[PDB]
Amino acid sequence: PRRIPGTTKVTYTNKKGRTFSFSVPVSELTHPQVTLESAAGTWREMDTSFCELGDIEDDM
Amino acid sequence: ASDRAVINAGGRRFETLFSTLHRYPDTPFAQLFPLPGRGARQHRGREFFLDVTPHVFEYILGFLRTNQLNLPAENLQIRAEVVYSMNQWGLLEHAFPPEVIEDGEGCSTGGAVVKLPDVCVVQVCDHMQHDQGVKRHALTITYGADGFQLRSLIRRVRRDLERQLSSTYWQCYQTNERAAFFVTTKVANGTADLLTTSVTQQLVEHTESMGYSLASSYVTLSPDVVHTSVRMLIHNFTFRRSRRVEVEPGDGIALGE
Amino acid sequence: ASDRAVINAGGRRFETLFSTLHRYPDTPFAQLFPLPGRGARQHRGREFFLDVTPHVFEYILGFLRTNQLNLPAENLQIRAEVVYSMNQWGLLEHAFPPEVIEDTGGAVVKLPDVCVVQVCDHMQHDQGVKRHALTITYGADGFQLRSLIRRVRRDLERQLSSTYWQCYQTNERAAFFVTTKVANGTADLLTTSVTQQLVEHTESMGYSLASSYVTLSPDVVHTSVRMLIHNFTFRRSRRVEVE
């Protein structure tokens, strides 16, 4: 298990031109966003080619 | 001595050396008043006056002898004053310096990136039915936003309930990014008090470890709308995110334009 | 040497510049401090006496030096003294300016320092299905209900489709959110997310949550309308300007 660092640094430039770091509390996701109806295409599918059914067009 | 300077900010006297304020000489802070030139005119010390609060200058001058800046979390007013004073003086870029490293980025061990909000409402609702006169619990934990680690929260709930829950079978798993679930078969009265306490204990321990603090809570108990005998005990907690020790994007309004 | 002025308020000595108290000349706070007149009589510095609290005067003088304000929420007696002292000295209208809305142009509104939000959820049941009629109602005018529904809808496109819920605006201070044909588990996702979007939208206006207290219909017989009345109390402690 890899622990989330929690804080992240982003670069912000002022009106004069001085750059510094905004520290943002940021956590990562854990569960996939499957509730969307759109399908990305990248998910691990289940193999079902070994199963024997009544398909006479296929082989045993 | 000639190295010491008597600086009076807001009516309070401070004494410090010349190398303390000139630790960053290129900044507009130490450039706009001549520390070494006034030491040749006045033999004892240089007398300068500032228009800042003395409690705010303690954080800025205390930073210059330490190279460490810690913004106040409990006092939101002084936190707004340190950010504005170090922005107009050009001194905040050396306290929190920018640094980006492409070679240390590791996306293979990380999921998608979301931002934690400043407030967090958590709803803990279990539905208590009567299975042959004995209570059964179907418990649901719901968060208000994404990012909160539910998989690590569930195993903390799961480890505590292996010693305290006496039933036939029970599960605990994650159903959504913001939702978790728990079912039990015919729990007793005294074991249900161990169930409601241990789940609400490990939940608020998980949110304090995330960097939040409890603002308010709420408990209610009411029957279901459709079914009469189905009870609904809802523990609703509200968590306020603690202020970070460094600067935040929420302090951007206090930066000054 | 001559530009600094000594302020003694409540047994505590304060020293600050001349132009900071005269940053706003039209305010009555600058009129009661004759800074060029007191510097002419006493050539060293001006000596003024006030009966205000020293902790309260640090917020008022801190606003004149740094153009920011954060009112303390942990102490209501200190915070109510700061707002009252800035009202009798005429400093609140420059700290909390009136807002400008473009609907026709008419821009005059004063946001309340204490506002209440009443969130009433109507749970009904007819022919095996159940529905929710959530009614969000703000206290006074000046708030932006157009942007809250934008935050409510955008946080709900990922969770559910537009068929099972509808959210629109009925009044300038009242918002409506209906919910039909949802499961038991996903109903807690909607009520917690709207409550999540309700608080941080008020935080984007410059307020702070004081307390929350909810009631619910404790009847065991069948009722045609069950009511979940969530009440919020917000206190204005800052100002938020986007860009």
From TrEMBL, chain A:
Protein name: Uncharacterized protein
TrEMBL record, chain C:
Signal peptide: none
Entry's Gene Ontology BP terms: potassium ion transport; protein homooligomerization
Ranges where the Potassium channel tetramerisation-type BTB domain occurs: 6-91
Residues of the full protein shown: 8 to 255 of 307
Name by which UniProt lists this protein: Potassium voltage-gated channel, putative
Single Gene Ontology MF annotation: ATP-activated inward rectifier potassium channel activity
GO cellular component terms, semicolon-separated: ciliary plasm; cytoplasm; kinetoplast; membrane; mitochondrion; voltage-gated potassium channel complex
Domain of life: Eukaryota
Species this chain originates from: Trypanosoma brucei brucei (strain 927/4 GUTat10.1)
